[PDB]
Amino acid sequence: VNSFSGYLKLTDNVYIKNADIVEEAKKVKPTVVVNAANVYLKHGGGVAGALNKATNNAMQVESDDYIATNGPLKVGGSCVLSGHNLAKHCLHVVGPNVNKGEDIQLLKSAYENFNQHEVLLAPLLSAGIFGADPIHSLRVCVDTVRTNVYLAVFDKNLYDKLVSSFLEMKSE
Numbered sequence: 001v002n003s004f005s006g007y008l009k010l011t012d013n014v015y016i017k018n019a020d021i022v023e024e025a026k027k028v029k030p031t032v033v034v035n036a037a038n039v040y041l042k043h044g045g046g047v048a049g050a051l052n053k054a055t056n057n058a059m060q061v062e063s064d065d066y067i068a069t070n071g072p073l074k075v076g077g078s079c080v081l082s083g084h085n086l087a088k089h090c091l092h093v094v095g096p097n098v099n100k101g102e103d104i105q106l107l108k109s110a111y112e113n114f115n116q117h118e119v120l121l122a123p124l125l126s127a128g129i130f131g132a133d134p135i136h137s138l139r140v141c142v143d144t145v146r147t148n149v150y151l152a153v154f155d156k157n158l159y160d161k162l163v164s165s166f167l168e169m170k171s172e
């Protein structure tokens, strides 16, 4: 498990790779794969749909059951559910939907959830359907997460831009 390979080390604990998170999970067999969720755990586009489809919809059914008994998450909150065939666990984390005006500062709260796990395979929260700047999401990740986070960025152009922008933010 957790056999990550081919990552660029950004900081002592943050790593990045140009890869699809679903194919990484199959290769790596992680203890925790992170889902970029919404508060009702209705898995639409982006990472949530890809993960769910790879579980043959098991993750959506499990999520419906979780909501029925526990109610919705808060923005910036999380829950641990099964990883099914992709990982031991899936950490469903709700970043702010800044397309809908939600507080971008809640992205720190979202990434703080990573600190409850030794090692995680993760995407950049809020940077897709939720419309946050991917560079900003990476900055919050680097400044917030103290545990080992392996980030999967599937788009090669975005990967290159993120590395490049990281170098500027780091050299000040």
Ligand SMILES: Nc1ncnc2c1ncn2[C@@H]1O[C@H](COP(=O)(O)OP(=O)(O)OC[C@H]2O[C@@H](O)[C@H](O)[C@@H]2O)[C@@H](O)[C@H]1O
Pocket (backbone or CB within 6 Å): 019, 020, 021, 022, 036, 037, 038, 041, 042, 043, 044, 045, 046, 047, 048, 049, 050, 095, 123, 124, 125, 126, 127, 128, 129, 130, 131, 132, 134, 152, 153, 154
């Ligand atoms: N298969 C993938 N592999 C790696 N990265 C991916 C993949 N799919 C998307 N990404 C990237 O991961 C980042 C996160 O984007 P989203 O998955 O859209 O997550 P988010 O912006 O937080 O929006 C969450 C919302 O989208 C719905 O899927 C979900 O149900 C929730 O309502 C983006 O940079 C996005 O381009």
